[PDB]
Amino acid sequence: GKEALRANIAAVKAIEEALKSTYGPRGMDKMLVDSLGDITITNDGATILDKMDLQHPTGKLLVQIAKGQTADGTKTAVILAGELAKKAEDLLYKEIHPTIIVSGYKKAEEIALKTIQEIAQPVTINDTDVLRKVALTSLGSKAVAGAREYLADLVVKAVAQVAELRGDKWYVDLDNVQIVKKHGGSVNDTQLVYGIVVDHPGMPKRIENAKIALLDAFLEEEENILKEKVDKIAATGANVVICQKGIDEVAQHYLAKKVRRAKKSDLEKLARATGGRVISNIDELTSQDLGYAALVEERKVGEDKMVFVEGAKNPKSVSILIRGGLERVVDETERALRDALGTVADVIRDGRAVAGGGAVEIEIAKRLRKYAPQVGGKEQLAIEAYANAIEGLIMILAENAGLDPIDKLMQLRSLHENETNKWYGLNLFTGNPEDMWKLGVIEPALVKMNAVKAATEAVTLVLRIDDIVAAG
Template identity: 30%
Template sequence: MAVDSDAEARLDDGERGKWTMTDEDARQYVRGAVDATVSLVESTFGPAGMEKLIVTEDKQNRRERVRVGDAGRIFDAIERMDGFAHPVAALFVDGADGMQSGLHDGTSTAVLLAGAFLDEGFELVDQGLAPSSVVVGYGIARARAGAVLDDLARSVEPDDQETLADVAATTMTTNLESAVRQDLSRRVASTVTQLSAGRDDGWINTDHAKILSQPGAESEVVDGLVLSRPTDAGPNGWGIDESIDDATIAILDREIDFEETASVLDGGEGVTLSSPEAADTYRAQLSDRIESTAETLVARGVDVLVCLEKLDESIVRPFEEAGIAVVDKATYPKEDVYRLAEATDGTVVSNLSELTDERLGRAERVGQRTVGEEVWTAFEGCPGPVLTVVASASTAEEARRREEALEDAIETTAIALMDGQLLPGAGAPAAAVATEIREHATEVTGREQLAVEAFADALDSIPATLARNAGHDPVAAVAALRTAHAADGRSAAGIDPQTGDPVDAWDAGVVEPRRVFSQAIETAAAIVEQLLTIDTVLYPNVTLPGYTPRSERN
């Protein structure tokens, strides 16, 4: 939103250097920034939401265009480029970022709720209600919301694969064909269940699940880790020429430097060669040392050497000639060498001298193949709790989108299984909480009652946006949904994206972890407490620009 010119006109020359807004002007400044930020993600919400094409930078600071369809990734793409320079927008986005980093779902819900809570709250403040009263009333409503969600929630067990697959499918709102979504959701459910097996604490480490997708790949779940490297990565190792059974694996995170331990030293530190004879002796001793080390590893049963760094060809060639397959420059991503150690029950070492028998990893099979623009080295039949979920794709862009969808689905499904609680989706929780709060709002005395009712009205923004993005009349859809919930105190009715009519979300298989919606409400409320109570905007000695994003319709 642009700075109000009338507000600037009210500042005399002595005050202009401090750039201060107070009261109504400050609220309008905050409200405009919030509305503009919400507008960035509103049209992406729900299974019928649209996507954004964003020009940003990748992690190597190279310009790229990405298609994204949820608030978390939209904000991330913007922050990788110029970011949110506007102070209010930055506060708003920072408050919502925790949803994406912690839960991988619910960020859009939190943003929409925060925007609606602030709109309703500002309306009450404009009518004379103190911001602190709005915050208190919202707190009362949140407490009631928790009780409603307790009654609405259902439990889920690890053997309920169908329900866990529904959770995964609900999360993957990316534009996927129905058959593809169902196939991938079943693989996600199976993966999360396997990751949970054998743990007494109930914790599921989703870092033990790697996601891969490349054009030409076939969808599967590999019992172990698939190391992926670009075909142009430039390692010196030949990799795995032929499949290796019952493989013993050594894993290093540093390059091997035999010069550090070479004994031909003419002048103390480092290698100083004072004559041609000394150089010949040094090279011969260094070559003997490399060959001796390779023979020692072979004698200990090492079949595969995996190194995070690129190894020198003078080291790789003798190792391979001795019968050790070398996979070097395994930096894509570099965390995979540590994940490989988890999978093979081995230990990552920095020096070959640290490589005891107990630190060697094992796999039933190790093989290698080229898939799309990557070389995949598969370590299968591993003893550790690591799995690789592979998704088929026809293009590189489709592969990226499926990897993102699977990443979110695994995180969300794991949360559902760890918590053991589910809620119906499709806007049903918001409608159920709104109905309950309206029914009991009159029990709240004082001005806070108005804020409690406003909280319920704001919740309607969730089903209304779902209906609007699906092409239906949001007013009619919300009215029909209110009627359905009024008729049944524990209704799971949500919005059917096909018809806009109420549908039982449990029966439709649209379910989500209880924690996602609960956390969305808490995140939105925290944002409101930060922004609703701002009555002065002060930025000393700077003339701030306005915040006027371009309309999507222009």
Template identity: 35%
Template sequence: MSQVNTIANVTDEVDGDEAVDQNISAGIALADVLRTTLGPNGRDKMLVGDGQVVLTNDGASIVDRIDIESPAAKLVSEVAHSQGGDIGDGATSAIVLSGALLREANELLEDGFHPTTIVNGYGEAATRARNRLPELATWENHDDETRRRIVETSITGRWDAERTAFLADLAVRGYQAARSTDGPRLENVTIHGIAGGGTADSKLLDGLVIDTDRSSTSVSDVPAPLPRRVEDANVAVVDDELTIQSPESTPQLSVEDTDALRRLQAFETGEYERYVDTLTTHNIDVLFCQKSIDDRLKALLAQAGILAFERTRQDEVHKLERATGASPIMRPGELNVGAVGHAHVVERRTLGASEFTLVRDSASTQVSLLLRGGTDHVVDETERIVVDAIDLLASFDARAGVVPGGGATEVALAADLRTWSRSIGDRTQIVVDAVADALETIPRTLARNAGHDPIDTLLELRHRHDDGDATAGLDVNTGDVADMYSRGIVAPVRLNERLIANATEAVTSILRIDGIIHVDEPVHEDGDDHDHQHAISGGFQSDSHGYPWAIGH
């Protein structure tokens, strides 16, 4: 997918107030791109490039697909990657909060505040808010119902209520199936999307599912018919190529007479038969090989009734080990009883337009989620939802507290910051109040995107919180200001902690920048200008004039 939008390209040498203005404008521009997607009723963005179309309101997905050329906007975009990668949710909220903090900072700068004063005030306010969060959270009696509510809150609005509940339950069951005594083992979950069918056709399977179209894994191509299904199968996994080994120092083998040729052929035949005899001695029914299998050996394996797969990816070798209990070996001669795995069934199946291999066993620690949808777009969006949901559940288990959603937590933190700021005796008080105003951007945006009056909604929320109702938030489906816990609208406390930390760190980094310098590309001694691009700061592409660098205080 090519990048399809450009955010605030900075190409001139600037410093001082002009640099600050350009940096703030770049960050605000990126936040404005995503602001309309925030919340359950956020509007989708259609991204078009290279003949492909992506329709999504997922903030992290949008940021991945737009061309961000400003170093300052790049810092803000990294908030989405950090939030989404670490938590699994909140990428859009983090960027929207960053944009709100930048807007407040811009007004403070116009009022004569020094950037250092704003940076210090933002830092103190963020610390206060993060310390207050545990007091707003509940920490006990969390079960799978709580997990389902967390996931439903995260994905509500991206699908209808019925499919939202179905996917939330599926994600929770998949996550729980991959847990062990040591906690969640996300590597034990394999997710495949299959176009064709309805979302409700998605299912959780014990064992491993290999997409033989997307993976390099393929069934050995032999004339003999191969079984589509093998039950009660003994499984061997070879972590190498299956062929006759030749000395690496001998690039070419010369045969001088027919006797030598016959001896060579007899040797090769004996080696191939030894491979097959070893496998049949251990009653191997299914063989997975990481690399290729010699054509002659393929035919012999098929004749022996062994279903052989070749070019299995290394990550799938590890998954097969967990799914079957087989220990990978380098050569068939190393096979022993302890290295043989077992599968209740190994089945080749066509789902949609793709070929799959299912390796299932009741004792497997590997599980697979097969996600269905009518079109590739629906499948891709469903896959993003489930992947994010599983990451979000892992974040919740790492710090098992929940806070009320619907903007309730942000309004409560804003009220606390305003109360606390009255005890501050210098200009920092105004900066802390600005952070409180920025936090309330979240409920205001939720109300606007849901079609409700943002001013009336915020006033009602403030009134309820002033009366001591710290769990009052906006139910975007009804427009009611209600107890979020009773409506099941909740989020992990760790999500809000990282949201505040990520947004504040990005904004304060931008505010510290007081100059942007353009450095010309050095000309190589051979006179060549080397017409290739260099990556700066995790993916920033310079133009043909050189490197834009940011200089901090």
């Protein structure tokens, strides 16, 4: 059923083309258009793939795959899978059975992962320059309005807190990072807080050693019931009370005499940080479900009130306030910062880093070409094709910078004949090849490995499927 396969390959190629030009540290932006008419301008690939109007099953699948295990790297996986698909197509026209191409690609994947594992430069949490570089790596091309060397600082400072070593590996519980945003000034007004932050005259403000009530949950009778509900909570010794559902202002008065938030993604991290737990029904509420916060308080953002939970019990607590002008700015800042956090977190947790600019890529290709003749006939071609498909990334990376792809590919290929140039990659601003390690173009080995892995998996899935059937 070639007719069903070609459509899959076309879908993959379509998504590649969708995310292609976004790639690199000079990646152009895409303009997403909602059917409403509203729009979203962005560089980040994950966001695109999220808001993107997915058509094909294989497409939605591919997206589902590229996002699996770390926000970034998706870009790489997608484009790589696209290249592999195209080269697979080229191989298919030569009447080569898919089960051969798959096997070849698998071998190539193994050799690739060996290659990355071999090249990788071990790093530690102490090598902060590396962390900074890795942070700054993804931050390039984000169109963030400056403060890259400051946002990177915030990242490096952020990951440092959320880290504790039980044994050999620090348990960087990334999920403890709260992220909010507001307008005004610029991203220089961005700032960290140790505790979680959340965007009537009410209850008191500065609570020291605060117990925090975390709760997701004829008229006269209802009043009695509601007051009963409030008193129940009051009888547990709760300093500050948090909710998600709408609270009757009468209960606000009551409690004031004793916020409703909006999102549970905050209440989550609040429960994480404070040490308390959420309750579905206040009838079950106790005094141990209350979270401990050593110095809770509230502060004014230039245009708005904002809640601060400082002095949270848990050591691994952290939040960041984002600031800027337009929505696109603060959003791109958010997503970029997420990417940074991801990359750095993976660097820390894994403890290995490599050079960008496509050094690892041309190295992997270089290796594959050597290993290719050592196996059978038809597989060798698949492996070679795999290598080429990898080089495609360098080429596209060159394209997105306004450079001639082939020339730079050949240059790097020529340079990587020396053992001592295994870090050399493409300086896109300069235009010439350079040692990407000194320029702080560093990325987590785990990201590269995962990208390769997921792309391979995706393409093999594309090739393994012979036909598409409607079921029930």
